[PDB]
Design a protein around this ligand. Structure first.
Ligand SMILES: *[C@@H]1O[C@H](CO)[C@@H](O)[C@H](O)[C@H]1NC(C)=O
Ligand SMILES: *[C@@H]1O[C@H](CO)[C@@H](O)[C@H](O)[C@H]1NC(C)=O
Ligand SMILES: *[C@@H]1O[C@H](CO)[C@@H](O)[C@H](O)[C@H]1NC(C)=O
Lengths: 492, 142, 142, 492, 142, 492
């Protein structure tokens, strides 16, 4: 499982008789779906990207002059003109210059002089800019099933499947070989203000690293440099990269300010570098709110028998997985394929099944298997794998687990509630209340009523309501509220 | 070095080595005087070359010819070792901060906070709602 | 024109007509590419004239002398017609103000106005002369 | 007199049997002094000026460069030094030049260059700035004695005399020749802060006008031009009129910003033109409050006999002069000299004299004579000179005259309030209060009391005092105060 | 002067008069352009004298030799008329002191000075101990 | 006698029957040990110095560069290296440099270049420091007797002796000739923060002054210059006096910042030159809390004859010394040796003398003798010497003398605070308290009580104790404390 490595891993449990489960997915985070009687999946957001974003405006730094010219006429003999004065891609300035005996003009006046030059800036020195298109952003969600095969932190499970998600496309169903189909139906978003973020990338270069940034629009839109739009030959306001010298009679020089790559790079020090891969422009924010339909899954390898209980050896001893769960790799030697009889018993009760398996029906296939992940109650206990037996104690302390589940539920409600608010009518209000209650206390209700069942839960709710109906102080009325809450969670 | 264009004028094409020399054109003499030339390239400046009478010396020019009309100069500016002024480019939990801001205000507003607390504790008579009143009283300051 | 200073450095005191000439000094000869000379007077520029080898040509220089050491050109810039920009030097209701000034004093001193009104209201007790008292108070802050 | 042709005229006349009178003199505003049994005199502040004022600062507007030099060194050979660099009165800058292959420098790079020029700006272009000094100002106040001769506005009376008055000088005596002498005790005061105004004067060239101005001190002290204080030849901050061109390999030109008198003229349009002539600098804001003495004057020609009865004719018919008085000119053909017989009566009361001549004892001289100035009561107005008869009807009312005199006296006391009150001690305060009361009530006492004498005035004052002591409400204290004021005025 | 070191590399010991001349080494020749040489001393600045082919002119090089490889220049610097700078060297009863500070604090708090009496004379009423209380209060302010 | 010309003088009187005296010495101050029937010594600290203080570190102000080398390698050849890079005593910086086709390196780009030069500074330019050692300091105190010869303000005294004192050695004994033996057991305290003072001594220069200084240790330890400890061949941190020129292909000059002694002198304006005397380094602030012995002092000339009363004549008139003492001198030219029957009688009391001689039994010797100093009570008095007479009066009151003695005692006890008392043991604390009380009240007891005797002291103590126990106000028992203090003072 690729989720046995990430620092943050949210647990979501499939309640008994449940076929739908909501989710919240964010970058660098995965949620291990687990449901009773069904295989456990892994769901996470691989990466968010856009492809071939639109180009809005490309500044260029190193201006390249060419074919400059001047022209002047004797004083009081009409202004001077130039064939290149009125054409495009030019930067022309007018001025007056002294004159006298050495200029072959009679009177000691001051005539007109004109000087200007083509301005098309140097190639491979442009600073293009792109802006994301909100509706075209593509979100990638990849779902992996649980198999007994151990997976390294940087290895790809063969069964990994991918899925694309945009604003328009909503519902898509995947296939996972023999396990079945997972119905993904997600709604997307993007926290970063796409209107206030323009990606700036200067033309490809080997020495210059990095070659991309994310900058505020109100800054990239007011750079004191020449600027054009893609598909235009001439450059607007090219005069910002040419300095005209003083006139000497007939000639006035047109200088060049050189490239500006140094100044631009200096001005962008300490700014994030946007991830780029070929034609894919990645992002770094946003989250996907989604629901998964487990209805179409089938548990794998259920026809196999059970191997003998004396042919097992540890290859990776039990260790803390960082999320209050255990992981162990066991290698078999007898006939294959078959199931893996694994059980755990609390110290002092050596004849009760206590393990909460995460891997679905751990099995050994023709070639592959033996990775088992489990959750155990607080305190010491013994893990049984056939003949083998290992000692272990859990640090969770139950109450901490319940509190952490409540905190995670509150966080999920805060993150996802911004969009899941229905108040259209009485039905809408009821749906919103039910969704809030579920997203808040589903884990609490499941843990509180573990294996009790529907009829036992209804009986408990009825007893609590009857107790609440008894007359008492106003604070004592909370018994009815608790009974109703339990009934709704045990009946909805 | 000397080309006769089809527009009725002659253009003198000079390199770096040709500075401060005398080049013959048509029937007159052109004496190149500009000194900032260089090997030819795209960056070519071409300015009118003045023509002066027999007894007049040149002033404020760097290309003059005698008894020849319509002469233009032209020379590149590449290869020469290289006003390089540069343009000016200007550079560039949720309630935890609110709780931190409140704590900082209380720390730096000891007098006002103490006065509010004293007022509450001397005219509240609402121990049940004392916390509710104090929450608003403390969080009001922003 | 040529001279000889006491420190062993020549001085080619040029003039307007020497432009683009080839003056001969000591064992060598050299030219004057400057093209803004004039007559001689107090307004006299005098800058070093470089010395370069035979297998070289000048770059952005006005005077260069070969086969000689220490030549200082010197010419007067006056004797011709006028580069110059002028410096920037700056150029050189009987009761309207009183009402505005009083209103400004009241607005910037709203506490003072409130105190003045309350004084007449409570302590002075001069409703008949309260208008006069207020007028005097307002005049107290012209 | 000269004062018959001016608008601002005041009839400051001393009380009956008085020997001195206080005066307030504002330039352009005459005053006429009269006294029973004495000749009448006219005085006025002719002009206020200072001569050879101290000069505070000098700006110049045309730099005169000369002896400019330049030096350079190849790269990695230290800086360039010139003898002129450390001298006085030199403007120069240190820069770097692009030395290389063509300048016979072995190592390509940047080399030091210095261009230093002696700067001492031209002559006949200094903008000298003089500053007024309060102590040394000198005032002139003429004294024209009334005679029988008419004087035009332009013509100057032959018998006119002049006097000087500095702040230090206090007492002066004038000689009127035939008319005696007059004693002047004048206190001078400047009504404006002279330290905040400085007169700006270009060097005296008469090519155009104007060449003098009065300018605010701050503006003249914040001019962006070279400035030197008198005595030190070197011009401080001389860089303002020199600009250095871009540096070439070995040559660094030093341009000159040229003449700048034109911009200064263009920046002083609409400013008042300071009025000066010779070595005197006039002013426009001042006043001298003097105390004329009229004790040594003697009326002229008191022994002259009556003129002819029928040899009197009107050179110029009587006309108003816009000063509540009537002018009148006559000729003569009989034996001269002789006193002019003049009188005025009222129609229906042909035996009552109402002629109060402004000119004292009119007389006919061998050369000149016959001018008459007088004021008549409103209503019936008849003139009897010899046998000539003229019909006149003067507007206004005696009440109006009293009100106007009171208002004028109050205004005059307001102008000289600075020196009209002394609070150094108690006796001085009492003297100042008495003088102010006399100034205020002089017109009222003179108009109301005519020929009353000591006994009638004393009886009226006694009656007023008794009225003040009579039974009445406390508001009657105004009557007692008026009685006291009238008694005090009669006493003095 | 020339000499071959034990390592097989030749060294030229230029002198003051050797400026802008030629030196023949082995079979090639060396060119010296340095203009900062002088008599020999310990102040010897020996640096590589790069050698180039016949097709390119030297750039940014003081000493260059042709038709020879591995030649080093070296020369002294004394006996030569002179760049200096300077480093930054920063420039280098008791009861009355307390009494003066106390007096200043009292004089800067006239309102506090009045309040001190207004409080002591009322609350304390213990002049014998009120003097000590006031002294302690005054000394409290630093 | 000698220190009568000094300003800061103190009088310490030893009680009759006492064989020791406590004392405190400080720079520019004297003392006049006086005891009944014993010669009056003079003690005064002369100077405090150390011998060859341990030099700490040396800054040298002129780095003599020598043997500089350079080498470089163009790109695609690896970073440049030089042999002297890792050798000691050499400093250098590595920098990039330009290359191209012009210098045999085909590939363009920035190469590498290094330039290292040996650093050393010649003699006569080392600003070596110095630091004091607490134990090694030597304190010298000079003790001289009283001879009846007047001594000038600068002339020495043949009979004076000297002694040295340091923390290590405490006791010592002197011999004044015929007067006896004076034993001093002085424990010294260094009165300055010696840990924060150092002598910045420029090396020897015959003409240029000054050379020595005292500077706060922090400043001298922060000078931005090369430094080393004596005995180190290298110069640690020698890059502070070397600036490298720009990289020009292969050349890279190494300029020299030149001499720095000028800047250092400019940075020590207004710093007290440290006194230097031979190899001795002088301090300026300190004190000695010494104990003076008087067990074996003998007064001289007790059994001389008497000069004839008639034969006497003055040499100097009595004058106010400046410390409430009368300085007088006489010269006699008759039979010698003898005694001078000095006596002064208060006006109205011809029989009772009130002159107590500071000079012990003034005597006329073959050489010298005649100078007599006296202290007299305020009032009008006539000084008698043989048949000579004079009229003299003092200033101030005996109450003033008592107050001055109390203030001097308080000041003396304040300066010995570091070693005035100890509470290690009860007996030690009691002894310290007794010593402090004696120091604070000895002058008061001596002036108030003189020659009373043991019986008068016992009677006074008993009477005061009885008065304390008698009736009085509850808080008016200060008489008890006064009696206790008087008894304690008179106990010895
Ligand atoms: C995973 O990373 C480790 C070290 O970063 C590397 O040795 C290993 O080869 C990687 N995984 C694979 C399958 O190569
Ligand atoms: C004064 O002016 C009048 C009229 O303007 C003229 O007739 C007369 O001649 C003038 N007199 C003098 C002295 O200017
Ligand atoms: C110093 O001593 C000398 C002799 O040693 C003496 O002549 C001189 O007067 C003394 N100085 C003073 C100020 O008395």
């Amino acid at each position: 499982s690729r989720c046995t490595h990430l620092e943050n891993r949210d647990f979501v449990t499939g309640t008994q008789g449940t076929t739908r489960v909501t989710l919240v997915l964010e970058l660098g985070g995965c949620v291990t779906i687990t449901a009773e009687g069904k295989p456990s999946m892994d769901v996470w957001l691989d990466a968010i990207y856009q492809e071939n974003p639109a180009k809005t405006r490309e500044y260029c730094l190193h201006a390249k002059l060419s074919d400059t010219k001047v022209a002047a006429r004797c004083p009081t003999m009409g202004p001077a003109t130039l064939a290149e004065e009125h054409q495009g891609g030019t930067v022309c300035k007018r001025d007056q210059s002294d004159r006298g005996w050495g200029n072959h003009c009679g009177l000691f006046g001051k005539g007109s002089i004109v000087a200007c030059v083509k301005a098309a800036c140097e190639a491979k020195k442009k600073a293009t800019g792109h802006v994301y298109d909100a509706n075209k952003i593509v979100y990638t969600v990849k779902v992996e099933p649980h198999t007994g095969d151990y997976v390294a932190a940087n290895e790809t499970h063969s069964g990994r499947k991918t899925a694309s998600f945009t604003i328009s496309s909503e519902k898509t169903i995947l296939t996972m070989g023999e396990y079945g189909d997972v119905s993904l139906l997600c709604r997307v978003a993007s926290g970063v203000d796409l209107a206030q973020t323009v990606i700036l990338e200067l033309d490809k270069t080997v020495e210059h690293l990095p070659t991309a940034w994310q900058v505020h629009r109100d800054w990239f839109n007011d750079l004191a440099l020449p600027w054009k739009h893609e598909g235009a030959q001439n450059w607007n306001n090219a005069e910002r990269l040419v300095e005209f010298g003083a006139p000497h009679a007939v000639k006035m020089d047109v200088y060049n300010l050189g490239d500006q790559t140094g100044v631009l790079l200096k001005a962008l020090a300490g700014v994030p570098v946007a991830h780029i891969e070929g034609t894919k422009y990645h992002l770094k924010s946003g989250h996907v709110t989604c629901e998964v339909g487990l209805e179409k899954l089938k548990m794998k390898g259920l026809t196999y028998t059970m191997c003998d209980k004396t042919k097992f050896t540890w290859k990776r001893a039990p260790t803390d997985s960082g999320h209050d769960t255990v992981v162990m790799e066991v290698t078999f030697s007898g006939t294959k394929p078959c199931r893996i009889p694994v059980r755990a018993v609390a110290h002092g009760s050596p004849d009760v099944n206590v393990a909460m398996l995460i891997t679905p029906n751990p099995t050994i296939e023709n070639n592959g298997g033996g990775f088992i992940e489990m959750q155990l109650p607080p305190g010491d206990n013994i893990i049984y794998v056939g003949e083998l037996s290992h000692q272990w104690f859990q640090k969770g302390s139950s109450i901490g687990r319940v509190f952490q589940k409540t905190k995670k539920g509150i966080e999920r409600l805060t993150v996802i509630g911004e969009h899941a608010w229905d108040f259209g009518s009485a039905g809408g209000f009821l749906s919103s209340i039910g969704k809030a209650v579920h997203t808040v206390l589903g884990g609490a209700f499941n843990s509180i009523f573990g294996g009790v069942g529907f009829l036992p839960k209804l009986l408990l709710g009825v007893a609590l309501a009857w107790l609440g109906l008894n007359m008492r102080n106003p604070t004592m009325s909370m018994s009815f509220l608790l009974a109703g809450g339990l009934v709704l969670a045990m009946t909805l | 070095t000397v080309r006769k264009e089809r527009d009725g004028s002659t253009v003198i094409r000079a390199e770096g080595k040709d500075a401060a020399t005398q080049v013959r054109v048509e029937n007159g003499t052109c004496v190149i005087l500009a000194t900032d030339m260089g090997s030819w390239c795209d960056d070519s400046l071409s300015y009118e070359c003045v023509t002066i009478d027999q007894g007049e010396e040149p002033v404020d020019v760097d290309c003059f010819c005698r008894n020849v009309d319509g002469v233009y100069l032209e020379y590149g500016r590449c290869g020469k070792q290289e006003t390089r002024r540069s343009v000016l480019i200007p550079s560039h939990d949720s309630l935890r901060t609110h709780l931190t801001r409140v704590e900082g205000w209380v720390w730096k507003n000891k007098l006002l906070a103490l006065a509010m607390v004293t007022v509450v504790w001397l005219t509240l008579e609402s121990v049940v709602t004392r916390v509710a009143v104090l929450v608003v009283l403390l969080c009001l300051a922003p």
